[PDB]
Amino acid sequence: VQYVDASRIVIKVNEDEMYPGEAGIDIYNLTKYTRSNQNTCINQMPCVSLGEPVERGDVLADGPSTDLGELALGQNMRVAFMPWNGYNFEDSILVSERVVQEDRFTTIHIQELACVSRDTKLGPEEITADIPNVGEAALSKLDESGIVYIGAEVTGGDILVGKVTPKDSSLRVPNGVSGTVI
Amino acid sequence: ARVTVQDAVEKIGNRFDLVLVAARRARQMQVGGKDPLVPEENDKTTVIALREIEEGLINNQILDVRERQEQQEQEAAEL
Amino acid sequence: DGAKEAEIKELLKLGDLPTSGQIRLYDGRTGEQFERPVTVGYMYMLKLNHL
Amino acid sequence: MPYDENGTPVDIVLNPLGVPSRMNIGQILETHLGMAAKGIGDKINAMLKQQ
Amino acid sequence: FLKPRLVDIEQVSSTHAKVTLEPLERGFGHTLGNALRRILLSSMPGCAVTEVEIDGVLHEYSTKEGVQEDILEILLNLKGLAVRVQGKDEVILTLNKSGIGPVTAADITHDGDVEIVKPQHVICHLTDENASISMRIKVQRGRGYVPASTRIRPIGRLLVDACYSPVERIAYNVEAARVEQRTDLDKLVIEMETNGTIDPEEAIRRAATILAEQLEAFVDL
Amino acid sequence: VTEFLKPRLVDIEQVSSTHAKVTLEPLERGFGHTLGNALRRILLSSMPGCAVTEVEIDGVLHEYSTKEGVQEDILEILLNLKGLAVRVQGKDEVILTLNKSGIGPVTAADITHDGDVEIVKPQHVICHLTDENASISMRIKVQRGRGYVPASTRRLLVDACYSPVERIAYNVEAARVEQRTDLDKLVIEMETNGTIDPEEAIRRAATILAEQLEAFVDL
Amino acid sequence: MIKGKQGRFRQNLLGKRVDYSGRSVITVGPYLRLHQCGLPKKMALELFKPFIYGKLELRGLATTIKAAKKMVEREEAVVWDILDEVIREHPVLLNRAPTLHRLGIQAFEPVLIEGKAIQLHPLVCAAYNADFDGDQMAVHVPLTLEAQLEARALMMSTNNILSPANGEPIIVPSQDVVLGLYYMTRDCVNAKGEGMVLTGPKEAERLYRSGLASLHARVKVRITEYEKDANGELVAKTSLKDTTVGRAILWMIVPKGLPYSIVNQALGKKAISKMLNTCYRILGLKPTVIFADQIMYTGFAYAARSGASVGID
RNA sequence: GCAGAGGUUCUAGCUACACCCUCUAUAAAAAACUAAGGACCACACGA
Numbered sequence A: 001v002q003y004v005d006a007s008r009i010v011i012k013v014n015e016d017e018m019y020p021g022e023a024g025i026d027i028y029n030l031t032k033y034t035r036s037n038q039n040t041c042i043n044q045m046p047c048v049s050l051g052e053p054v055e056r057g058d059v060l061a062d063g064p065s066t067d068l069g070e071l072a073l074g075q076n077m078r079v080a081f082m083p084w085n086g087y088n089f090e091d092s093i094l095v096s097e098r099v100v101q102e103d104r105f106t107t108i109h110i111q112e113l114a115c116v117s118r119d120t121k122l123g124p125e126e127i128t129a130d131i132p133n134v135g136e137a138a139l140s141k142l143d144e145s146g147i148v149y150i151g152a153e154v155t156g157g158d159i160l161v162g163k164v165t166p167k168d169s170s171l172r173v174p175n176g177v178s179g180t181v182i
Numbered sequence B: 001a002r003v004t005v006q007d008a009v010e011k012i013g014n015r016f017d018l019v020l021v022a023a024r025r026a027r028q029m030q031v032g033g034k035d036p037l038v039p040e041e042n043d044k045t046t047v048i049a050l051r052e053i054e055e056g057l058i059n060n061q062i063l064d065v066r067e068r069q070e071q072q073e074q075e076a077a078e079l
Numbered sequence C: 001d002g003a004k005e006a007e008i009k010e011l012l013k014l015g016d017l018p019t020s021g022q023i024r025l026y027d028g029r030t031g032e033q034f035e036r037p038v039t040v041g042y043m044y045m046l047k048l049n050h051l
Numbered sequence D: 001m002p003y004d005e006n007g008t009p010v011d012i013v014l015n016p017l018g019v020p021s022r023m024n025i026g027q028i029l030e031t032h033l034g035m036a037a038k039g040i041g042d043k044i045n046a047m048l049k050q051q
Numbered sequence E: 001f002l003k004p005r006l007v008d009i010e011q012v013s014s015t016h017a018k019v020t021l022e023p024l025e026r027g028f029g030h031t032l033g034n035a036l037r038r039i040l041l042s043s044m045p046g047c048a049v050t051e052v053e054i055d056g057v058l059h060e061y062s063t064k065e066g067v068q069e070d071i072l073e074i075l076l077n078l079k080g081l082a083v084r085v086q087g088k089d090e091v092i093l094t095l096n097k098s099g100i101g102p103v104t105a106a107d108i109t110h111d112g113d114v115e116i117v118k119p120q121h122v123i124c125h126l127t128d129e130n131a132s133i134s135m136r137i138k139v140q141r142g143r144g145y146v147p148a149s150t151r152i153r154p155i156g157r158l159l160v161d162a163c164y165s166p167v168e169r170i171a172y173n174v175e176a177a178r179v180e181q182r183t184d185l186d187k188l189v190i191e192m193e194t195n196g197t198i199d200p201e202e203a204i205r206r207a208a209t210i211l212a213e214q215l216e217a218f219v220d221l
Numbered sequence F: 001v002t003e004f005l006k007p008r009l010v011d012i013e014q015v016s017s018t019h020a021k022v023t024l025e026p027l028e029r030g031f032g033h034t035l036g037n038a039l040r041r042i043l044l045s046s047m048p049g050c051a052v053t054e055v056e057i058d059g060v061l062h063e064y065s066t067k068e069g070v071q072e073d074i075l076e077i078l079l080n081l082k083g084l085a086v087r088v089q090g091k092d093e094v095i096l097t098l099n100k101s102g103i104g105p106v107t108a109a110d111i112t113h114d115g116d117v118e119i120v121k122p123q124h125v126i127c128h129l130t131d132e133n134a135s136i137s138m139r140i141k142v143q144r145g146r147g148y149v150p151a152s153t154r155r156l157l158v159d160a161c162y163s164p165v166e167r168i169a170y171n172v173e174a175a176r177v178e179q180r181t182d183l184d185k186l187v188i189e190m191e192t193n194g195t196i197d198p199e200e201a202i203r204r205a206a207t208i209l210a211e212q213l214e215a216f217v218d219l
Numbered sequence G: 001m002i003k004g005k006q007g008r009f010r011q012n013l014l015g016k017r018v019d020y021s022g023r024s025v026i027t028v029g030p031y032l033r034l035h036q037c038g039l040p041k042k043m044a045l046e047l048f049k050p051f052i053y054g055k056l057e058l059r060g061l062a063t064t065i066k067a068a069k070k071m072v073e074r075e076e077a078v079v080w081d082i083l084d085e086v087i088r089e090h091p092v093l094l095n096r097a098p099t100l101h102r103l104g105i106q107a108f109e110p111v112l113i114e115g116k117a118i119q120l121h122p123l124v125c126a127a128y129n130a131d132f133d134g135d136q137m138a139v140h141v142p143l144t145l146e147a148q149l150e151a152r153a154l155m156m157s158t159n160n161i162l163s164p165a166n167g168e169p170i171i172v173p174s175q176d177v178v179l180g181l182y183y184m185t186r187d188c189v190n191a192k193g194e195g196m197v198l199t200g201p202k203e204a205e206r207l208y209r210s211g212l213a214s215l216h217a218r219v220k221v222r223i224t225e226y227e228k229d230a231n232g233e234l235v236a237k238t239s240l241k242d243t244t245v246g247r248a249i250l251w252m253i254v255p256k257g258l259p260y261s262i263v264n265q266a267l268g269k270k271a272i273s274k275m276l277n278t279c280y281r282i283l284g285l286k287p288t289v290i291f292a293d294q295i296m297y298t299g300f301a302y303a304a305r306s307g308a309s310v311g312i313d
Numbered sequence H: 001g002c003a004g005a006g007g008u009u010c011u012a013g014c015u016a017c018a019c020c021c022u023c024u025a026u027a028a029a030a031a032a033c034u035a036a037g038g039a040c041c042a043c044a045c046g047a
């Protein structure tokens, strides 16, 4: 491993593996947080550091739900098989606040919101933040052009873009949805 | 608060009839300015009406008599 | 071709844990010991996407 | 949450009544083997905590 | 009637220590043990990070060049950071380490009021000599568990869930006391597995107080 | 950081002099159970009382053997003897035994209250005597002791009933204050023998626990 | 379009989607009474939003209805207090996804809960035939005074103790409370506290909490059972009966009318169903509801204290 | 909208069921009033 980073991993291949011409390094650009087909997160986490001898076929970086090259769907958690005050009545499950405190089962969810400017009648929709009759706090999160700044925490009902009905059409966070704009 | 209506069904045998008689009294209590005869223990009008039936303060016959008396009072107001 | 119960008993015996697999447990709230020692161990747990 | 004699609180408490009817007796075996594995891990950790 | 004392407070290890309450009568010892364990696990003053501002990243869900772990991984590591503060309630700690080698709590700039219990604890790994990391971590005292969403300005500041509880695992053992003059007396030994930020005897005394003022309500005015 | 919501006793409903249902609206999350559990054990097993059930056998070789001429079984009399509350005597030791009896149910009134015996319920019936002439059993429970002590651990031997509260139940429900995370609300139902009022018993239990925590008050 | 499930008459006329309605997963929450249920705070604000707007206008906190709409979006403390008033006596219908029988929809008194999941009282879970394997219930809010009175009079769970199909209690305890009672109402040949004489069930409970006597040790304790032989009059009878401590403790839960013989058995599932049926037959419905709720509470508590556990050994 | 005209605002605001105000040629002093286009088919999942 010549160089390792959360974004990318550089392996310097052994000379025997190396082809005679134009060879000697293998660069793997790890995919960072990306929107999954089921709205989860595909995160590629490196599991090796500098100088670690990596053999052919070895796993350089764990994928989502992957731990040191082993599939890790969930968390091995402490289980007590007892009926506790009826909280676990039919098949219900108690969980300690310790689990939430340690973020044991917390999961990142990626939701992709698309606002489309269209060639409407009486002029096209305007993506620029020309929208009137809006709160100043909502405009503050938006940039000059109306697009929300990267990494700005937003809450359901907050404006994210600046689409204007040709003379209020701007996309807003769906209610109950919150979080940074990756 | 009445969480059980069994005493009210004793007062009105049909039980389905108890919903109808209580509804008329409750409507009188809410839409109309009618004082709750039963003391209001932080109760909504529907519960007060059920309590009045359980008390026996209000029954289908009693509600009819009160409505007839109000009609007579309206004639007295007309003078 | 997985482990038989005897192998699990031996593995428990390797640790300080009782071979029976039942560990005496105490209520968090009252602080009174439960009768009939309960089963405690780590089982893999999955959160499902039906949040 | 309930705690054993060592004081470690159990994170998840499950109804044991699902085991008899829904005959997934493996989860009990799974729990026992997980306890044995964590006992091994705890002895290793105790050896590692000290020198 | 007899009243207990912390006759012995032994620090078997930095993380966890055992506290003994010898003059306890029958029945009283078990009650005090259970109540003390619950009050200690539930609500004790503690110090934990609550807001982190990495200079080079905008949001937690991103990577920084030259850092092996993710920014969110950095926040997860920093959440369980052993910090004690005395004096002012909130303090901002600055970390600036450059070059290769994993950064540690020792790398953080040392201030007079705050001393790190566990400098050896690892935050992230700097895998590039050229790359460097700069951050300002804000630590305040609180109780119990405070989710990040519950708390609360610019996009740079990252909110991290705060776990103010200094005690991790607590157990009390009730055994017969060694006193010979009066039998049936049972000493109480309480072991507290803590992050190290809280003093054992001080934590026990503080929990006893909190119980007392909560108990003072029951007695009539 | 040391400021926790302090419970206020919003209501102390007394269904009977014996039965009370004190409730505190605020408390703290996971504190109502802690205070409730601590209070329950302290009054149940550590609140002292002056009812020594064990009394001198009269006219019976064995406690199990039943004396003739009295309608009630000897065990039934023993259960009634455990029931008599007997207010705390100034003298800690048991000093009073009176067996005077009359035809029909014989109440606690006949034994009387010599010195500080102060029997709580004269109405309570010790036993039913079929024969007017026969005078037997009765006697008085006057030794101070803490909690319930069984006959096996402690003439005629009866399981002791020193504990003032016959039964206590602590119940916790989650009630938020204004707009806040829900906090434990604890209601304690206490039925006392009658030596002390249930509210007075709660006060006595609180002081007893406070004395244990007195050393660690952080000055 | 005219015919079939796709067809409008089946598609809409027969079944019309309704306003003031919502779905969420189910949660136990045993602490609730049988008549009441658990309702999410956020869900209630949306479900009762017109009632909230009206109450705000009557209060005068909102001068106009547009202001009331803004206040609901703000979710200020005043809006939550208004929600508590509307939630206090407006019954909410709870409907299981397959409504095979009338019991599938039962109204309940809504109680605000912090969690985002509807809580259904455990005894009625068997009636719904629902489990907690991520089952989802549609929740509807009756509006009119006729609707609310109809809900409270008939729809409410307390009214439907017995299944319409058979004159048997459909709120029969199902899983955990029955196990806890069976552990409680059990006999052991030898256990600590065996052979003692107890003044009453209160003393049995006090001994059990002290730990001197176990739940399932047999003792000679008097029981004051009231007999309904006189029609409408309760005749108290006190007698010494050889029973377990646990059965003595459960006797406090039982009302005065019922005889002590029913508790003296093992009290399994058919036994507890017969107990509930006898309670309904002899006493009123309201005593039966209180008895069922107390049964559930005591069973859960003593099952938790029991520490029942399944193991390979 | 007293009829015609204009209207604070809290999108738009004599009809959508609407509603109110002031004013006399044309806009400007003021508070109380009210719910939006979603069709079909496949796949998958959860009950």
Ligand SMILES: NCc1c[nH]c2nc(N)[nH]c(=O)c12
Binding pocket: H007, H008, H013, H020
């Ligand atoms: N819909 C009528 C209307 C438009 N603008 C208004 N301004 C005011 N003050 N009053 C109203 O009634 C109206």
Ligand SMILES: [Mg+2]
Binding pocket: G130, G131, G132, G133, G134, G135, H047
């Ligand atoms: Mg199901």
